[PDB]
Amino acid sequence: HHWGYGKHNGPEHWHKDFPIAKGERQSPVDIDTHTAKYDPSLKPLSVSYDQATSLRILNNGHAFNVEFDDSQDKAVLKGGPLDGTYRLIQFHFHWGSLDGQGSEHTVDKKKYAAELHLVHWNTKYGDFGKAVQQPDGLAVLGIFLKVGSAKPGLQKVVDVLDSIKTKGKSADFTNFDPRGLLPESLDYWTYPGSLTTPPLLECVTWIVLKEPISVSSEQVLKFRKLNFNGEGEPEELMVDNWRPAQPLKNRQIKASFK
Ligand SMILES: C[C@@]12CCC[C@H]1[C@@H]1CCc3cc(OS(N)(=O)=O)ccc3[C@H]1CC2
Ligand SMILES: [Zn+2]
């Protein structure tokens, strides 16, 4: 009886195995745009993905992860609210059963169709596993998806999903350029939080871009054909793999822009 997104093992149950679920810096949160304060001391984000080397795509039973070779200092996030350099390890999405829901963060309670997370680890901790044990170990860049025009840079991801339908399937996925998933603007909100799935570790500086990307209805429909289950198990569509907004508690959301 492992965690997931259903009635019996979903977000409202997670605290039993992972008590930090009710902790002081849980994610996601609602971003109240009027209360978020402009912080003129924040720097522009530096997203340097020119040398990013993707390796593989994996259905892990909750989402699909596009994994990167992080053995060298290549694809890095720095600047913004961050001290030091954070290395890209994977990206993944959260999405809905319908276009009206799917994002984890919300903006004045608005839910987007999906949300992309580019996960990076602080190089001062040497590797990913050690970084998640630290309060500044990860930086996750969050990008909202709305349904409209297709995102051409997403289609290579969409087309490989047929080959990783079920939990535990992976496929080679080289030479994928994550710069094709970014909006024009790097205006962002930032706050201290957590992983949004178990083990819910409070190790993340969240950087959430204001500008959504547009993807087509057909692109997101293909996300919804994936399966939570393994091959030869009852088919459970991989939809609504988002955690709802959590209490903000004693935190401030800062804006990079006026
Ligand atoms: C803690 C860990 C090692 C043991 C288990 C591992 C978890 C699994 C769940 C998870 C979900 C995420 O999604 S998100 N949405 O927070 O970016 C991002 C990262 C991890 C990793 C990080 C590394
Ligand atoms: Zn995520």
Q: Is the CB of 103 under 6 A from ligand 1?
A: no
Chain center to CA of 246: 16
| Beta carbons of 8 and 2 less than 8 angstroms apart | no
What is 120-143 written as a DSSP string? EEEGGGSSHHHHTTSTTSEEEEEE
Our answer to whether residue 105 is catalytic in this structure is no
Q: 14 with 4: CB under 8 angstroms?
A: no
How far, in Å, CA of 200 to CA of 197, rounded?
Answer: 5
Distance from C-alpha of 140 to C-alpha of 90, rounded to nearest angstrom: 10
- The residue behind tokens 């051409």 is 152
Q: What are the residues whose beta carbons fall under 8 Å from the beta carbon of 177, sequence distance 6 or more?
A: 49, 52, 153
Q: What angle do CA 15, 20, 24 make, to 5 degrees?
A: 125
- Write out the E strands in 60-203: 64-68, 76-79, 86-95, 106-107, 114-122, 138-147, 170-172, 188-193
Task: Identify the DSSP state of 162.
Answer: G
- Return the residue whose CA atom lies nearest to atom 7 of ligand 1: 199
Resolution (A): 1.5
- Mind listing the domains of the chain with CATH numbers? 2-258 (3.10.200.10)
Residues 35, 75: Cα–Cα separation, whole Å: 33
Q: Annotated binding residue at 117?
A: yes
Report whether 20 contacts 195 (CB < 8 A): no
Whether residue 196 has its Cβ less than 6 Å from ligand 1: yes
Is residue 235 classed exposed, middle or buried when 0-12, 13-18 and 19+ CB atoms within 10 A define those classes? Answer: exposed
Cα(147)–Cα(227) distance, integer angstroms: 21
- The first and second tokens of residue 185, run together, are 């603007």
